[PDB]
């Protein structure tokens, strides 16, 4: 016979790239947008803006 | 039916908590730094 050596995702190395969080109701609330912005830094230049 | 948005995820570590100075009167003596 032949076994099936299963693999776990978290135990891989790639897992460090993305963060995985279990959101259960996504399939329902995905009907619209979520639309969060992030940021941008800005240097304080001299002279009046 | 003219879909809309929803409240966005906010980071678990979001700790604005600056109204503690800005509620009514700010106590600068030690409340800062934590900010």
């Amino acid at each position: 016979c032949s076994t099936l050596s299963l693999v776990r995702f978290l135990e891989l190395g790639l897992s460090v790239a993305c963060v995985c969080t279990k959101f259960p109701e996504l399939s329902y609330v995905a009907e619209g947008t979520i639309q969060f912005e992030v940021q941008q830094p800005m240097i304080a230049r001299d002279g009046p803006h | 039916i003219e879909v809309h948005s929803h409240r966005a995820l906010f980071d678990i570590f979001k700790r604005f908590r600056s109204d503690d100075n800005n509620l009514y009167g700010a106590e600068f003596d030690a409340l800062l730094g934590t900010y």
């Binding site: 135990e11 190395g13 109701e25 | 678990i12 908590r17 109204d19 509620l23």
Partner: peptide
């Protein structure tokens, strides 16, 4: 976590590095 509008105001795996 899904909150309403209420407000306040390890293991040892094998890998190559």
């Amino acid at each position: 976590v899904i909150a309403n509008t209420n407000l306040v105001t390890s293991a040892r795996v094998r890998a190559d590095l």
